[PDB]
């Protein structure tokens, strides 16, 4: 097999969708730190 996860959104499932959520949270936290440090930088 190794290709069935491409046919008609069959790949989308609990494990795959959890991975996308985790990366979303990490990106949001990383972005939040950026502007908070930017404003404290006084520039």
């Amino acid at each position: 097999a190794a290709r069935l996860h491409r046919f008609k959104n069959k790949g989308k499932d609990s494990t795959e969708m959890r991975r996308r959520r985790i990366e979303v949270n990490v990106e949001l936290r990383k972005a939040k730190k950026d502007d908070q440090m930017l404003k404290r930088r006084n520039v």
């Binding site: 290709r3 046919f7 008609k8 609990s14 936290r29 440090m37 930017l38």
Partner: protein, 876 residues
């Protein structure tokens, strides 16, 4: 007392003596291990005994040392080595002489050779194995059973053991394989073993394929192997052909491709499914690689460097033959087709997607006529193929040309959703969802929007086979509508979008379809819950009362799930229960981010009480424990400083999660939550800072944790220093020494995965230093009297960043972090750092390169660095 008598109990339905004898022989296997091994080998080597008894004995020998688990296999290997050398010789000769003599097709003796050699080869034992096997194959007087057994063992060797130990012996074994592949061999069973052996041994012969004469001979035997009367040799030879495509593509130019082009096309056209599958896979792998090399060619072109390796555009040249066949084979499905089943029709449909991506514009002229003709044909097979082909063409070509076609074919799409055949309805739901994701301009328009919603909501009550598929279309439509509205009033949330009219209706339908009794099939419940999450996340201002109603329902379902925890009776029930809990927490996270502060306060008490109950009842896997962690994290972010009322109850569970060496992902989530906790509850984490500091240091002390945990430990150290302020002097020296030790680490440059790990470690180290300096900088315009505490270590700081600037392996993040540091010590100390950077003038390359990077982070921070540096460059 003969071992054959007890061996027959293994195959007999009675098993009372099965386990009894097995445990007795296992007690022998630990105490009288040479005795048990020798007697078993003697029985296997006796042709007079029943051959089923010999097979049973061979199974015992294999199971005595083989193991699927790598750790169990490793200790079993050490157990084998822990025996007298003469004792192992008593059975090594028996195994190497028993094979082939048995008149069986399975040839269980080949398994025994595989297990012993996979352990003795690493320790350079049994040096006569390879010469003996080669002699057996190459001997002209060998019988069919002799050769069939030997090739089976060779393939078992290549598959099982690692490729490192056979790199030097690859040339010897290859000559044996191709000798059994030539057409002069009478039997086909031997030829089948030869093809199978070469499949698992293609990695060893990298140097052999480099040779020209060897390569030409190698493909000659496999090409003549495909055109064979039998089918098993035919399919097996094709799998060999696709593997060579995937790795040794460069050498295919020299008349290699013109030979394969005839065989592969015929293979796809064949009515037999297996040969058709391999033909499709071969023409999909070339497209898959062609995409990757095209990326490399563009990257080199934009960098001004000639490409490392180029392509010949095989897929582009031969598309006019693949497309007519690929469309035709789509009309081969059956109404009673399993959803989880690899078929030539499914493979053809998937392959069409990569065809579109490889060639964006050249595909449409060869597929548009087909879909036009068979879009209304009475047979549902051809109607299904036409609509399925429509979805694949969306990705590749430029949407500007596609707009006339999609807008013209929209009226025929909606009526297809009411086709009497469920299969056509399923494909219709998929293709309308794709048309929304890729071409939302045609989907969001006044004429077609209202009928689209009418059919979409109507489909939510259909059978699960299509009901799951249409649900994902709703999520795509909501995202398109949310992006369609552009308020541009700095509010960042549009007041009203096209979905505002019937927002409450579709939300109500998604709520009830989740509670369907048959949501297990086709992951209907999992799909339905997620589209609800995307709907709520993509809600507008007007839908505020609607999202308030959904929060009440979601909270109600959480309390219900508590009761289902008490009663459980099966493992499958546990899996369903855990999945439901994970989805419910996922939805709660999204609604909490959307809801206003006022409503967050009243429901916070119930949310925390339910969340801690899930963590307390750790009767399941780590998914429930992990999910509750970041669920609290998003609650803290939206609550602000009001979370202080929950510190006394959250403290014991935070320590439990932090002190857990197993489940490294769960420990990772707890670490991330600490950083959010200090940010929101700033200047108030002091009573809880000492415990989390000690717990973090203990986890950093040991080594058997996952490597990914370490960098985040350093990042939270810097964030804590920023939050607490000047009170970090208690642990200032300890964290500084730990950071200094971790910073001076070097790993081999060849391993890219180690390179990325070390680069991420560098980023966390740099970010920690920025937080350390900012902690003592203070809010006031002047430097605080605590900033000289880190003064002695400034020289090591500049030496470290100089080391980073020396390496060309710097990524886009390390440069930004380093530039942020340089500005920080520039504004923290002042006059003294001018001499320090003077002694290391090579840092200027980092300052200039910080602006050339496309990332705005490096440009802004380096601009700050050069601005303040120039103040001290000409201050007098």
């Amino acid at each position: 007392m003969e071992l054959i008598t007890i061996l027959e109990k293994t195959v007999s339905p009675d098993r009372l003596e099965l386990e009894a004898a097995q445990k007795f022989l296992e007690r022998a296997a630990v105490e009288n291990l040479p005795t048990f091994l020798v007697e078993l080998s003697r029985v296997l080597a006796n042709p007079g005994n029943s051959q089923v008894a010999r097979v049973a004995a061979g199974l015992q020998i294999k199971n005595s040392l083989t193991s699927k688990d790598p750790d169990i296999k490793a200790q079993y290997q050490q157990r084998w080595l822990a025996i007298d050398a003469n004792a192992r010789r008593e059975v090594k000769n028996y195994v190497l002489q028993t094979l082939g003599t048995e008149t069986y097709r399975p040839s269980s003796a080949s398994q025994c050779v595989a297990g012993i050699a996979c352990a003795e080869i690493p320790v350079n034992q049994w040096p006569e194995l390879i010469p003996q096997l080669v002699a057996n194959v190459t001997n002209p007087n060998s019988t069919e059973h002799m050769k069939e057994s030997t090739l089976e063992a060779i393939g078992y060797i290549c598959q099982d053991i690692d490729p490192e130990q056979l790199q030097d012996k690859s040339n010897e074994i290859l000559t044996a394989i191709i000798q059994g592949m030539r057409k002069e061999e009478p039997s086909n069973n031997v030829k089948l073993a030869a093809t199978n052996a070469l499949l698992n041994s293609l990695e060893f012969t990298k140097a052999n394929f480099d040779k020209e004469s060897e390569r030409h001979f190698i493909m000659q035997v496999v090409c003549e192997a495909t055109q064979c009367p039998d089918t098993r040799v035919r399919v097996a030879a094709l799998q060999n052909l696709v593997k060579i495509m995937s790795l040794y593509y460069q050498y295919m130019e020299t008349y290699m491709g013109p030979a394969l082009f005839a065989i592969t096309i015929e293979a796809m056209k064949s009515d037999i499914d297996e040969v058709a599958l391999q033909g499709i896979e071969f023409w999909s792998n070339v497209c898959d690689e062609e995409m990757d090399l095209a990326i490399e060619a563009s990257e080199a072109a934009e960098q001004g460097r000639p490409p490392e390796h180029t392509s010949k555009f095989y897929a582009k040249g031969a598309l006019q033959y693949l497309v007519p066949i690929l469309t035709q084979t789509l009309t081969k499905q059956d109404e009673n087709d399993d959803d989880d089943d690899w078929n030539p029709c499914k493979a053809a449909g998937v392959c069409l997607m990569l065809l579109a991506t490889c060639c964006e514009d050249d595909i449409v002229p060869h597929v548009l006529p087909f879909i036009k003709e068979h879009i209304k044909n009475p047979d549902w097979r051809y109607r299904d193929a036409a609509v399925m082909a429509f979805g694949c063409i969306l990705e590749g070509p430029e949407p500007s040309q596609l707009k006339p076609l999609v807008i013209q074919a929209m009226p025929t799409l909606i009526e297809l959703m009411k086709d009497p055949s469920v299969v056509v309805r399923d494909t219709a739901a998929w293709t309308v969802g794709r048309i929304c994701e890729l071409l939302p301009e045609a989907a969001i328009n006044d004429v077609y929007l209202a009928p689209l919603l009418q059919c979409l909501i109507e489909g939510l009550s259909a059978e699960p086979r299509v009901a799951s598929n249409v649900c994902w279309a709703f999520s795509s439509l909501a995202e398109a509508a949310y992006e369609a509205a552009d308020v541009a009033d700095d509010q960042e949330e549009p007041a009203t979008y096209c979905l505002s009219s019937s927002f409450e209706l579709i939300v109500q339908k998604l709520l009830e379809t989740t509670d369907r009794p048959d949501g297990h099939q086709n992951n209907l419940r999992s799909s339905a819950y997620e589209s609800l999450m995307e709907i709520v996340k993509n809600s507008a201002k007007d839908c505020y009362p609607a999202v308030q109603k959904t929060t009440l329902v979601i909270m109600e379902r959480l309390q219900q799930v508590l009761q289902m925890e008490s009663h459980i009776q099966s493992t499958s029930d546990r899996i369903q229960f855990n999945d439901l809990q994970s989805l419910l927490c996922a939805t709660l996270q999204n609604v909490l981010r959307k809801v206003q502060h006022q409503d967050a306060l009243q429901i916070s008490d119930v949310v925390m009480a339910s969340l801690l109950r899930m963590f307390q009842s750790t009767a399941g896997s780590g998914g429930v424990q992990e999910d509750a962690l970041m669920a609290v994290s998003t609650l803290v972010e939206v609550l602000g400083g009001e979370f202080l009322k929950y510190m006394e109850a959250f403290k014991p569970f935070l320590g439990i999660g932090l002190k857990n060496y197993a489940e490294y992902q769960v420990c990772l989530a707890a670490v991330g939550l600490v950083g959010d906790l200090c940010r929101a509850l700033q200047s108030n984490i002091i009573p809880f800072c000492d415990e989390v500091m000690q717990l973090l240091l203990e986890n950093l002390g040991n080594e058997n944790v996952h490597r990914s945990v370490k960098p985040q430990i350093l990042s939270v150290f810097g964030d804590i220093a920023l939050a607490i302020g000047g009170e970090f002097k208690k642990y200032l020296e300890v964290v500084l020494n730990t950071l200094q030790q971790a910073s001076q680490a070097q790993v081999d440059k060849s391993d890219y995965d180690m390179v990325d790990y070390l680069n991420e470690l560098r980023e966390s180290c740099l970010e920690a230093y920025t937080g350390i300096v900012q902690g003592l900088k203070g809010d006031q315009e002047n430097v605080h009297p605590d900033v000289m505490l880190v003064q002695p270590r400034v020289e090591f700081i500049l030496s470290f960043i100089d080391h980073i600037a020396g390496d060309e392996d710097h990524t886009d993040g390390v440069v930004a972090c380093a530039a942020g540091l340089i500005g920080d010590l520039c504004t923290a100390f002042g006059k003294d750092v001018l001499k320090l950077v003077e002694a290391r003038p090579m840092i200027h390359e980092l300052l200039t390169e910080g602006r050339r990077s496309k990332t705005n982070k490096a440009k802004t921070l380096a601009t700050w660095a050069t601005k303040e540096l120039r103040k001290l460059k000409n201050q007098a």
